[PDB]
């Protein structure tokens, strides 16, 4: 396939907005936990609160209590289990497709590399001299000058 600038920049923008959403959700969870921790600690929750949350609400604004210890039922055991089975199957399918695509692309690249090395060994004699050179990419440079002869 061939990749273009506009497709590149829309992928850039959508992964930027996805990482923004991930950061937002993680920070919302962190600030909920810190606002609940300030009910009993009052110091370390204030460190993890937002300045905006400190402006809006005061610490010790939430309270929680112990509802009784309950054992989850077998219906939601098997529901969580069948969810786990299906989602592990979906991850297995994604891994299969990723491995297949990587194998195809790497096979194309290695056929190109094998052709390149076969061309090198059918092209270059041991009398010729080769050295590595940068631009930062590695390139082979052959020296044909008479200055050493």
């Amino acid at each position: 396939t061939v990749m273009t600038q506009e497709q590149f920049v829309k992928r850039r923008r959508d992964m930027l907005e996805h990482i923004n959403l991930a950061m937002n959700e993680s920070s919302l969870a962190l600030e909920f936990v810190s606002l609940l921790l300030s009910s009993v600690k009052e110091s370390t929750g204030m460190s993890s609160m937002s300045p905006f949350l400190r402006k809006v609400v005061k610490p010790s604004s939430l309270n929680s209590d112990k509802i009784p210890y309950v054992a989850p039922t077998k219906k939601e055991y098997i529901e969580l289990d069948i969810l786990n089975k299906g989602w592990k199957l979906q991850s297995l399918n994604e891994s299969k497709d990723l491995l297949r695509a990587s194998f195809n692309k790497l096979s194309s690249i290695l056929q190109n590399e094998h052709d390149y090395w076969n061309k090198i060994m059918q092209s270059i004699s041991n009398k010729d001299v080769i050295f590595k050179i940068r631009d930062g990419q590695k390139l082979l440079a052959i020296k044909y000058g008479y200055e050493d002869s």
Partner: protein
Amino acid sequence: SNQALYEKLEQTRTILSVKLAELINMTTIADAQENSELAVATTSVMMVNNQ
């Protein structure tokens, strides 16, 4: 240089030997332990992104 090639080859060989087996081994169910849809989600995404 060749000692570094030894160490890198050996480490990569061991982790290739263990890694796919771990990838499929963590696809198990037990009442290791996943009592939450969050645990299921995290283990499933760490399969693809870690193994």
